[PDB]
From a paper:
In vertebrates, a group of at least 16 inner kinetochore proteins, collectively identified as constitutive centromere-associated network (CCAN), neighbors the [name]-A nucleosome. The CCAN (whose subunits are indicated as ‘[name]’—for centromeric protein—followed by a letter) interacts with the outer kinetochore and contributes to maintain centromere identity by participating in [name]-A loading at every new cell division cycle. In this study, we concentrate on four additional CCAN subunits, [name]-H, [name]-I, [name]-K, and [name]. These proteins have been shown to be proximal to the subunits of the [name]-T/W/X/S, [name]-O/P/Q/U, and [name]-N/L complexes in cell lysates, but their organization and pattern of interactions remain unclear. In this study, we elucidate the molecular basis of [name]'s essential function in kinetochore assembly.
We generated crystals of residues 1–171 of [name] (a fragment identified by limited proteolysis) and determined their crystal structure by the SAD (single-wavelength anomalous diffraction) method to a resolution of 1.5 Å using a SeMet derivative. The structure of [name]-M1–171 is globular and consists of a five-stranded parallel β-sheet surrounded by six α-helices. Structural superposition with representative members of different families identified Rab proteins as the closest structural homologs of [name]. Thus, HsCENP-M has the fold of a small [name], but may be unable to bind (and therefore hydrolyze) GTP. Experiments with MANT nucleotides confirmed this prediction directly. [name] is devoid of all essential sequence signatures associated with nucleotide binding, hydrolysis and conformational switching of small GTPases. An invariant feature of [name] is the presence of leucine at position 52 (of HsCENP-M), equivalent to Gln61 (Q61) at the end of the Switch II region of Ras. Thus, the first step leading [name] to diverge from genuine GTPases might have been an impairment of GTP hydrolysis, followed by the loss of other features associated with GTP handling. In conclusion, we identify [name] as a ‘pseudo G-protein’, in analogy to inactive kinase domains, indicated with the term ‘pseudokinase’. [name] (∼20 kDa) elutes as expected for a monomeric species.
Author numbering: 15 to 55, 61 to 167
Amino acid sequence: TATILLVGTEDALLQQLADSMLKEDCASELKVHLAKSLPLPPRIDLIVFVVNLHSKYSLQNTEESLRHVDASFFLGKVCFLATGAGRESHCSIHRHTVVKLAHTYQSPLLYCDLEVEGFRATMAQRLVRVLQICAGHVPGVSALNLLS
């Protein structure tokens, strides 16, 4: 009844995030699809671009994939999720690049270390709520209202 597309090149992290989102409990029935890239080879309510700040390939793949997304998706139905930004080991230039990306496509930029169980759990809560909003399940709040 609410469907999210996770786009990212790290299968394992996408899977653990998906599992985190599916972890109990949710009033709506959540479906998760994963893609390594866009364009894809089903109704999709929310797209989350998971960007690995330690991987230049991740950045490039996000940048390229974005070109295939219809503009109506950026009306609150796209979120960026940067991983590695809280770590001193990450490249600052990449972080700036993704901040500029999220700004350009006027979409939220969220940060999480997906390798940390608790942090990923909380982020999954946030994303479940955003997904429900985008799917029209939250009274008085549409994807349009997410725009800020």
